[PDB]
Design a protein around this motif. Structure first.
Motif, PDB file in Angstrom:
ATOM      1  N   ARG A 101       0.822  -1.215   0.000  1.00  0.00           N
ATOM      2  CA  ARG A 101       0.000   0.000   0.000  1.00  0.00           C
ATOM      3  C   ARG A 101       0.861   1.272   0.000  1.00  0.00           C
ATOM      4  O   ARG A 101       0.550   2.243  -0.699  1.00  0.00           O
ATOM      5  N   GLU A 102       1.931   1.256   0.795  1.00  0.00           N
ATOM      6  CA  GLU A 102       2.802   2.420   0.943  1.00  0.00           C
ATOM      7  C   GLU A 102       3.715   2.593  -0.267  1.00  0.00           C
ATOM      8  O   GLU A 102       3.927   3.713  -0.738  1.00  0.00           O
ATOM      9  N   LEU A 103       4.253   1.485  -0.767  1.00  0.00           N
ATOM     10  CA  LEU A 103       5.119   1.526  -1.941  1.00  0.00           C
ATOM     11  C   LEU A 103       4.367   2.022  -3.178  1.00  0.00           C
ATOM     12  O   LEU A 103       4.872   2.888  -3.901  1.00  0.00           O
ATOM     13  N   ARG A 104       3.147   1.519  -3.377  1.00  0.00           N
ATOM     14  CA  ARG A 104       2.332   1.806  -4.567  1.00  0.00           C
ATOM     15  C   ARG A 104       1.797   3.243  -4.660  1.00  0.00           C
ATOM     16  O   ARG A 104       2.000   4.060  -3.754  1.00  0.00           O
ATOM     17  N   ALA A 105       1.120   3.528  -5.774  1.00  0.00           N
ATOM     18  CA  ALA A 105       0.696   4.877  -6.143  1.00  0.00           C
ATOM     19  C   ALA A 105      -0.308   5.506  -5.179  1.00  0.00           C
ATOM     20  O   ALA A 105      -1.451   5.036  -5.052  1.00  0.00           O
ATOM     21  N   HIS A 106       0.139   6.568  -4.495  1.00  0.00           N
ATOM     22  CA  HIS A 106      -0.743   7.361  -3.652  1.00  0.00           C
ATOM     23  C   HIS A 106      -0.315   8.832  -3.601  1.00  0.00           C
ATOM     24  O   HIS A 106       0.807   9.205  -4.019  1.00  0.00           O
ATOM     25  N   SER A 107      -1.246   9.631  -3.030  1.00  0.00           N
ATOM     26  CA  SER A 107      -1.477  11.002  -3.375  1.00  0.00           C
ATOM     27  C   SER A 107      -0.879  12.054  -2.497  1.00  0.00           C
ATOM     28  O   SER A 107      -1.211  12.174  -1.218  1.00  0.00           O
TER      29      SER A 107
HETATM   30  K   LIG Z   1       4.827   5.650  -3.743  1.00  0.00           K
END
Ligand SMILES: [K+]
Ligand SMILES: O=c1[nH]c(=O)c2c([nH]1)n(C[C@@H](O)[C@H](O)[C@H](O)CO)c(=O)n2CCCCCCOP(=O)(O)O
Ligand SMILES: O=c1[nH]c(=O)c2c([nH]1)n(C[C@@H](O)[C@H](O)[C@H](O)CO)c(=O)n2CCCCCCOP(=O)(O)O
Ligand SMILES: O=c1[nH]c(=O)c2c([nH]1)n(C[C@@H](O)[C@H](O)[C@H](O)CO)c(=O)n2CCCCCCOP(=O)(O)O
Ligand SMILES: O=c1[nH]c(=O)c2c([nH]1)n(C[C@@H](O)[C@H](O)[C@H](O)CO)c(=O)n2CCCCCCOP(=O)(O)O
Ligand SMILES: O=c1[nH]c(=O)c2c([nH]1)n(C[C@@H](O)[C@H](O)[C@H](O)CO)c(=O)n2CCCCCCOP(=O)(O)O
Ligand SMILES: [K+]
Ligand SMILES: [K+]
Ligand SMILES: [K+]
Ligand SMILES: [K+]
Ligand SMILES: [K+]
Ligand SMILES: [K+]
Ligand SMILES: [K+]
Ligand SMILES: [K+]
Ligand SMILES: [K+]
Lengths: 146, 147, 146, 147, 147
Positions: free
Chosen positions: D141-147
């Motif tokens: 969740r933290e590694l992946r795409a967020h805003s």
């Molecule tokens: K990221």
């Protein structure tokens, strides 16, 4: 089985036994009305899978023949591993029976006894070909026809 | 003969002496068959072989892998060889290219030396492997589409 | 190797040894001109492959670190099986070197002796990182440029 | 917090008592981390686990597999565990989802009981596996795409 | 009530007597569950099973594989069973279909006879396998898209 297109790939390592295995396959082939199957030779068992893949694009059944005899190192274990993985992958990729007629023995006597020579107990080359042709016929019946 | 085939060779460096022997056998067979300059690439370990063979496979008709894996006191030996077998087999079928297997897997150091092709060795795996690659490439050329 | 993008994933099971393995990797990294690699921790070795897959989408090399020690059941054999299958599959899917620095030992002393502590015989964490960085530079040279 | 993660649990029924223990450990850890109602699915055998995890992976962030395989008098034991290993590993990489492994593989029945989390057990595999799943999901969740 | 499921059965003929027993158990379970006429196909060997199950999976909700592999004097036994394991597992996940495993793998012929479901047998693997397939099919039907 007069309508099936058969192909045979056999390795040359231990030449005498290979000739026996190849001899059994051709006999069963002729008996079932197929007088001229496609025959291809390779140098080693590891080279079998890649040639069967090519043969599968133009045939209804492929028969693989060879002998792998154990030595003094764990190398024997890794040659047979590759053959297992390769042939299984090819069969399911191409939806084609790839019959397994590759001997895997502890001694040379054991291999000779399973090749179909005058005084052998069994002939794996014949068994394998009967397996390929019958599976091809079954798939023909199951699949789309008129 | 095999003057038209494009050959590549990838060899690991762990146990450097034996690697040189294996590499030496391959090059001799290559020159004998009319191929004077094959593509040669070195890696640090056996585990790194498959990923480099994949890259070499997009520009060559045959790839030869060379190396030595010697057993220790832990089950680690078993897992190094497992990776190599899985990797090379997958590469060959993905790219429809012969990836010859010339990686020694022995119990002792003597056994490896005896199979490398030194002055008093019983055999030479580097030579056998190259002869395997070149011949399988020629066969595939004959089976495949030509005019 | 100042241009290479390195990532490191290490398991926490047996924390002391993990710290040593991680310590060796960072040193070699700094020596080669890479002052801050991507470091990610996981709970177990089984969890390593799926995190390396994600890391592979924006790095040129991935190093996996951990220790698996045998017990009284055949369980040991199946944890190592998964790790070998997983890492091998990831490397070829992404065309990226996934260096293997996961210790697999019979006793705790054996693992300690291969981690790079003051009196250890070797350091797997350092060897693995040297393997990753070199393979990345080779692929860089082979591939398309300029 | 783990309150945002969507968890699924698949457990086999062969050796029912131990299964209930394994399943009980998983639910406790789930409730502790703020997840009161995870998706629970039962199957008849361990071989049936992979194909049900594949389906569950299409709408969950984490999957936990639970079961017990005990050795007999034939080499059959070796082949059941081989399938489970192959299946779960393939599923996790296909779907990019953590499939936690909580399938016991023992020599005796005592060994299995001692690792299930009963009153006098030495450890609890069902709890360990769920903690592994939830943590790996949070990391991704933290590694992946967020805003 | 499994009266809506479409079942298929593929069984090898090597060791014919035992095959008949295994096949007999499957059909009885089938009839009990309200399926009077499943698709039955025979093959010559166990290695031939995977490729026929792939074809059967395009038109059925569950496939049952039946056969017997008995160990000899060579390491050949190990490689026949390896193929079957890898094949069936791959087919199940490719097609998202339960491929029940009812292939015996024993050390002696007595052991195989004892697990086939003859008058004086200890168990019947043909029956267990069919119960496994039909149940997994029903679960998948419940999980998947319905109205
Ligand atoms: K990221
Ligand atoms: O059909 C075969 N049958 C074989 O028995 C065979 C073959 N092929 N190859 C070579 C081929 O597998 C292949 O051409 C090479 O690996 C090249 O890639 C072998 O090296 N062998 C020898 C088998 C390995 C075991 C004996 C070696 O002695 P050792 O175990 O004492 O070191
Ligand atoms: O890095 C590790 N190293 C390890 O040594 C390890 C790990 N991880 N995990 C658990 C993880 O692999 C994983 O998180 C879980 O399986 C959850 O999926 C373990 O259970 N172990 C212990 C391995 C089991 C063998 C030791 C216990 O004795 P036993 O043989 O009686 O079970
Ligand atoms: O070709 C090799 N040949 C090798 O012999 C080798 C290699 N490679 N690697 C490691 C590399 O394959 C690899 O690069 C590393 O795992 C890092 O990714 C090793 O650790 N080894 C050492 C042999 C495996 C273990 C035996 C050593 O004794 P041990 O059991 O005490 O560890
Ligand atoms: O979760 C399980 N846990 C299990 O312990 C288990 C399962 N499942 N199955 C059968 C399932 O793998 C599967 O449902 C069937 O194979 C049908 O596909 C088993 O046969 N077993 C029994 C363990 C297999 C080893 C013992 C085999 O008996 P034997 O070696 O004494 O002849
Ligand atoms: O259902 C089976 N059950 C079997 O038990 C079986 C089968 N099939 N096949 C052959 C078939 O798997 C297949 O037709 C061939 O592989 C041809 O592709 C066998 O050779 N066998 C026997 C297994 C080993 C063969 C020889 C006996 O072992 P030994 O050579 O060590 O004495
Ligand atoms: K075809
Ligand atoms: K039809
Ligand atoms: K090519
Ligand atoms: K042609
Ligand atoms: K990358
Ligand atoms: K270039
Ligand atoms: K998901
Ligand atoms: K289907
Ligand atoms: K639904």
């Amino acid at each position: 089985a007069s309508g099936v297109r058969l192909a045979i790939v056999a390795s040359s390592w231990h030449g005498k036994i290979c000739d026996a295995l190849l001899d059994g396959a051709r006999k069963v082939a002729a008996g079932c009305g197929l007088d001229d199957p496609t025959v291809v030779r390779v140098l080693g068992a590891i080279e079998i899978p890649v040639v069967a893949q090519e043969l599968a694009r133009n045939h209804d059944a492929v028969v693989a023949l060879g002998v792998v005899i154990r030595g003094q190192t764990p190398h024997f274990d890794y040659v047979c591993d590759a053959v297992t993985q390769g042939l299984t992958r090819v069969s399911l990729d191409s939806s084609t029976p790839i019959a397994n007629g590759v001997l895997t023995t502890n001694t040379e006597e054991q291999a000779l006894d399973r090749a179909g020579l005058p005084t052998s107990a069994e002939d794996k080359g014949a068994q394998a070909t009967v397996a390929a042709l019958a599976t091809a016929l079954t798939l023909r019946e199951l699949r789309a026809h008129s």
